[PDB]
Scaffold this active site. Structure first.
Site, PDB file in Angstrom:
ATOM      1  N   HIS A   1      36.731  42.549  34.818  1.00  0.00           N
ATOM      2  CA  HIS A   1      37.485  42.622  36.075  1.00  0.00           C
ATOM      3  C   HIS A   1      38.241  43.931  36.212  1.00  0.00           C
ATOM      4  O   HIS A   1      38.410  44.435  37.315  1.00  0.00           O
ATOM      5  CB  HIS A   1      38.481  41.460  36.187  1.00  0.00           C
ATOM      6  CG  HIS A   1      37.847  40.121  36.007  1.00  0.00           C
ATOM      7  ND1 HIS A   1      36.936  39.613  36.903  1.00  0.00           N
ATOM      8  CD2 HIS A   1      38.010  39.178  35.050  1.00  0.00           C
ATOM      9  CE1 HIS A   1      36.552  38.412  36.504  1.00  0.00           C
ATOM     10  NE2 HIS A   1      37.185  38.125  35.381  1.00  0.00           N
TER      11      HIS A   1
ATOM     12  N   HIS B   1      46.856  47.966  33.257  1.00  0.00           N
ATOM     13  CA  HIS B   1      45.529  48.105  33.798  1.00  0.00           C
ATOM     14  C   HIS B   1      45.650  48.676  35.191  1.00  0.00           C
ATOM     15  O   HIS B   1      46.741  48.859  35.707  1.00  0.00           O
ATOM     16  CB  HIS B   1      44.829  46.754  33.874  1.00  0.00           C
ATOM     17  CG  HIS B   1      45.548  45.776  34.749  1.00  0.00           C
ATOM     18  ND1 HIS B   1      46.561  44.964  34.283  1.00  0.00           N
ATOM     19  CD2 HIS B   1      45.462  45.542  36.078  1.00  0.00           C
ATOM     20  CE1 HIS B   1      47.055  44.257  35.282  1.00  0.00           C
ATOM     21  NE2 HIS B   1      46.406  44.597  36.388  1.00  0.00           N
TER      22      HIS B   1
ATOM     23  N   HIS C   1      43.754  48.790  39.347  1.00  0.00           N
ATOM     24  CA  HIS C   1      42.796  48.381  40.374  1.00  0.00           C
ATOM     25  C   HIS C   1      42.434  49.624  41.177  1.00  0.00           C
ATOM     26  O   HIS C   1      43.310  50.457  41.445  1.00  0.00           O
ATOM     27  CB  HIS C   1      43.419  47.331  41.303  1.00  0.00           C
ATOM     28  CG  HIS C   1      43.995  46.170  40.565  1.00  0.00           C
ATOM     29  ND1 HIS C   1      43.328  44.972  40.405  1.00  0.00           N
ATOM     30  CD2 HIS C   1      45.157  46.057  39.893  1.00  0.00           C
ATOM     31  CE1 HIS C   1      44.079  44.156  39.680  1.00  0.00           C
ATOM     32  NE2 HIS C   1      45.194  44.785  39.358  1.00  0.00           N
TER      33      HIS C   1
ATOM     34  N   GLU D   1      46.295  47.381  45.720  1.00  0.00           N
ATOM     35  CA  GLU D   1      46.498  45.983  46.100  1.00  0.00           C
ATOM     36  C   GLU D   1      47.685  45.889  47.061  1.00  0.00           C
ATOM     37  O   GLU D   1      47.531  45.426  48.187  1.00  0.00           O
ATOM     38  CB  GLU D   1      46.727  45.171  44.838  1.00  0.00           C
ATOM     39  CG  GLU D   1      45.554  45.251  43.877  1.00  0.00           C
ATOM     40  CD  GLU D   1      45.403  44.027  43.026  1.00  0.00           C
ATOM     41  OE1 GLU D   1      46.285  43.762  42.193  1.00  0.00           O
ATOM     42  OE2 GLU D   1      44.373  43.356  43.142  1.00  0.00           O
TER      43      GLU D   1
ATOM     44  N   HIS E   1      49.236  48.697  37.091  1.00  0.00           N
ATOM     45  CA  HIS E   1      50.090  47.554  36.766  1.00  0.00           C
ATOM     46  C   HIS E   1      50.455  47.525  35.302  1.00  0.00           C
ATOM     47  O   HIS E   1      49.583  47.386  34.441  1.00  0.00           O
ATOM     48  CB  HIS E   1      49.344  46.269  37.106  1.00  0.00           C
ATOM     49  CG  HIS E   1      49.180  46.073  38.573  1.00  0.00           C
ATOM     50  ND1 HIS E   1      48.237  45.229  39.123  1.00  0.00           N
ATOM     51  CD2 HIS E   1      49.824  46.655  39.615  1.00  0.00           C
ATOM     52  CE1 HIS E   1      48.330  45.287  40.438  1.00  0.00           C
ATOM     53  NE2 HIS E   1      49.285  46.139  40.761  1.00  0.00           N
TER      54      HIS E   1
ATOM     55  N   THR F   1      47.694  38.780  40.738  1.00  0.00           N
ATOM     56  CA  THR F   1      46.796  39.082  41.854  1.00  0.00           C
ATOM     57  C   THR F   1      45.330  38.754  41.579  1.00  0.00           C
ATOM     58  O   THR F   1      44.455  39.049  42.418  1.00  0.00           O
ATOM     59  CB  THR F   1      46.867  40.564  42.213  1.00  0.00           C
ATOM     60  OG1 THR F   1      46.317  41.314  41.121  1.00  0.00           O
ATOM     61  CG2 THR F   1      48.313  40.989  42.533  1.00  0.00           C
ATOM     62  N   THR F   2      45.036  38.155  40.422  1.00  0.00           N
ATOM     63  CA  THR F   2      43.715  37.585  40.155  1.00  0.00           C
ATOM     64  C   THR F   2      43.903  36.143  39.729  1.00  0.00           C
ATOM     65  O   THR F   2      44.994  35.765  39.293  1.00  0.00           O
ATOM     66  CB  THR F   2      42.932  38.288  39.039  1.00  0.00           C
ATOM     67  OG1 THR F   2      43.432  37.879  37.756  1.00  0.00           O
ATOM     68  CG2 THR F   2      43.042  39.776  39.155  1.00  0.00           C
TER      69      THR F   2
HETATM   70  N1  LIG Z   1      46.992  42.166  38.555  1.00  0.00           N
HETATM   71  S1  LIG Z   1      48.268  41.432  37.782  1.00  0.00           S
HETATM   72  O1  LIG Z   1      48.975  40.571  38.732  1.00  0.00           O
HETATM   73  O2  LIG Z   1      49.128  42.414  37.116  1.00  0.00           O
HETATM   74  C1  LIG Z   1      47.574  40.377  36.537  1.00  0.00           C
HETATM   75  C2  LIG Z   1      48.069  40.365  35.264  1.00  0.00           C
HETATM   76  C3  LIG Z   1      47.549  39.508  34.316  1.00  0.00           C
HETATM   77  C4  LIG Z   1      46.502  38.675  34.668  1.00  0.00           C
HETATM   78  N2  LIG Z   1      45.874  37.671  33.843  1.00  0.00           N
HETATM   79  C5  LIG Z   1      46.348  37.183  32.615  1.00  0.00           C
HETATM   80  O3  LIG Z   1      47.361  37.581  32.123  1.00  0.00           O
HETATM   81  N3  LIG Z   1      45.651  36.003  32.196  1.00  0.00           N
HETATM   82  C6  LIG Z   1      46.117  35.204  31.209  1.00  0.00           C
HETATM   83  C7  LIG Z   1      47.295  34.481  31.719  1.00  0.00           C
HETATM   84  C8  LIG Z   1      46.812  33.287  32.471  1.00  0.00           C
HETATM   85  C9  LIG Z   1      45.401  33.054  31.996  1.00  0.00           C
HETATM   86  C10 LIG Z   1      45.104  34.139  30.959  1.00  0.00           C
HETATM   87  C11 LIG Z   1      46.014  38.689  35.925  1.00  0.00           C
HETATM   88  C12 LIG Z   1      46.518  39.513  36.847  1.00  0.00           C
HETATM   89 ZN   LIG Z   2      46.775  44.055  38.309  1.00  0.00          ZN
END
Ligand SMILES: NS(=O)(=O)c1ccc(NC(=O)NC2CCCC2)cc1
Ligand SMILES: [Zn+2]
EC number: 4.2.1.1
Length: 257
Positions: A61, A91, A93, A103, A116, A195-196
């Site tokens: 992703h 990371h 986007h 985003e 981010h 945001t994912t």
């Molecule tokens: N794009 S963001 O909002 O900064 C973001 C950061 C982390 C994650 N995902 C993540 O940390 N996943 C783990 C936590 C819940 C499931 C596994 C997704 C989006």
């Molecule tokens: Zn992010």
């Protein structure tokens, strides 16, 4: 499973993740004229001097630069935050074209990319517990525009060839995330979400007003990554951004006027 294509993209996510239509979803458009200066906002404290980066991972992703978050080595405090938030990963986007990729938007303007820096509230003990809390995470968002190169980004760009496809990781020690920051720490802040998927409503968003500039060549190297695994059909990792979501019953606050 979810992604950014026509058949599994942001318009589909609500079917597996109903919180996609929730009350504090991210990202959002930052309407600069409607944001409220909040004199009660404390200055941001970014303390990254003892940061320990470990590894870089293509997760299908985006790519994450991961840190040792088992001690208070790289922390964010102050601003809207109560307590201490530990840096776990950063990371980006980005777009397929320089005119899209971020985003968050600013008065509907899209930037070429968005960084981010993800942090979690140490009062919850680990990241998995923190994402289950309304004040569990703080994500520092930084816009990228295309212009001059960002020297502090180049070490990231040059390792990308080693993590082209999903599931690839490489050692990535001694990287200093201070080299990714703009000069000013003026920011907007609001309560939001990942945001994912799983889109959990656990994030205090802190979005810096000042973008950083990166070069055409730098962003072109992001666009050579793959969403797919090795030996699967090649699909370029581009446009891995979720569009702005309804603000609903939220006020964006500004640290500056
Ligand atoms: N794009 S963001 O909002 O900064 C973001 C950061 C982390 C994650 N995902 C993540 O940390 N996943 C783990 C936590 C819940 C499931 C596994 C997704 C989006
Ligand atoms: Zn992010």
């Amino acid at each position: 499973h979810w992604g950014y294509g026509k058949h599994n993209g942001p318009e589909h996510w609500h079917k597996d993740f109903p919180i996609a239509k929730g009350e504090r979803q991210s990202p959002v458009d930052i309407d600069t004229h409607t944001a409220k200066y909040d004199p009660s906002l404390k200055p941001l404290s970014v303390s990254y001097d003892q940061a320990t980066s470990l590894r870089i991972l293509n997760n299908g992703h985006a790519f994450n630069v991961e840190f040792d978050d088992s001690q208070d080595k790289a922390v964010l405090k102050g601003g809207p935050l109560d307590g201490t938030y530990r840096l776990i990963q950063f990371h980006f986007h980005w777009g397929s074209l320089d005119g899209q990729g971020s985003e968050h938007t600013v008065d509907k303007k899209k930037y070429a990319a968005e960084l981010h820096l993800v942090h979690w509230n140490t009062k919850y003990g680990d990241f998995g517990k923190a994402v289950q809390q309304p004040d569990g995470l703080a994500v520092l968002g930084i816009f990228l525009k295309v212009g001059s190169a960002k020297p502090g980004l180049q070490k990231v760009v040059d390792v990308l060839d080693s993590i082209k496809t999903k599931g690839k990781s490489a050692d990535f020690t001694n990287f200093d995330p201070r080299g990714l920051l703009p000069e000013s720490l003026d920011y907007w802040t609001y309560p939001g979400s990942l945001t994912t998927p799983p889109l959990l409503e656990c994030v205090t968003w802190i979005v810096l007003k000042e973008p950083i500039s990166v070069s055409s060549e730098q962003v072109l190297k992001f666009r050579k990554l793959n969403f797919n695994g090795e030996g699967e059909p090649e699909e370029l990792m581009v446009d891995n951004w979720r569009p702005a979501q309804p603000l609903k019953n939220r006020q964006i606050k500004a640290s500056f006027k």
